[model samples]
Target: AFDGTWKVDRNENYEKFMEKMGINVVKRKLGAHDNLKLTITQEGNKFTVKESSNFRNIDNVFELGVDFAYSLADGTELTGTWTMEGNKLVGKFKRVDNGKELIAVREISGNELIQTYTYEGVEAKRIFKKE
Candidate 1:
């Protein structure tokens, strides 16, 4: 069900969430308007994700339940695995530097794709539209 390019539409509490993640204000300001887009393709248990934003562009491929490394736009390194939970894609990643956990989920609602992130105690959502 998640096999298309999705563009960022809006964000909820993202600035504060970024703050909780230790992102500097200047970078957060730029990230707020990063124009992030993701192209996701799934085949069986493997998924390929192409991420593009004002900060950087990169592609990551991983299989369900397999641990892999990923880096955030701000250069925060993470190691984690993504697994299917019901109909949602759930991710549990730990920061390489501090070992703090970051949880994320992806789901589709109507014509929009909703991605949620939680780090420390702050939670944020980024809504996306298929293109």
Candidate 2:
């Protein structure tokens, strides 16, 4: 159901979660206020997402059940799949270096899209507003 640009508004426990994910303070500080914006489009079972932020801009293409390699601004690599479950878009990824699981969920609520992330034992959220 997501088909437009969404700008990040605020974050909850993002820095702490990043720390738990083994990110250094310098990168975590930069990531905490990255001003990330996401543009997403879906057709059938295929989805494309364009990510823009202070760190970088990149496009990701993936199918509902296919795995792909993705990298973060901090150069952390992951392999994952995005799956649709009910009204939410659920993602299960494993860190290429550590092999630890990272989970992400996205769902729309009112005029906002909420994305929840879990890594190790920490949870964080980045809420977005449609642009």
Candidate 1 per-residue C-alpha lDDT over 56-124 given as tens digits, one digit per residue, 9 for 90 to 100: 888999999999999887788999999998889999999999889899999999989999999999999
Per-residue alpha-carbon lDDT of candidate 2 for residues 11-114, written as tens digits (9 for 90 to 100)? 99999998997888998899888999999998889998999999888999999999999998878899999998899999999999878999999999999999
In model 2, the runs with Cα more than 4 Å from the true position are none
TM-score attained by model 1 = 0.96
RMSD of each: 0.8, 0.9
What pairs collide in candidate 2? none
What residue pairs are clashing in model 1?
A: none
lDDT of 2 at 131: 90
All candidates' lDDT scores?
A: 0.92, 0.92
* For model 2, the run of ten residues with the poorest summed lDDT: 18-27
Tell me model 1's lDDT, rounded to 2 decimals.
0.92
**Lowest lDDT 10-mer window, candidate 1?**
69-78
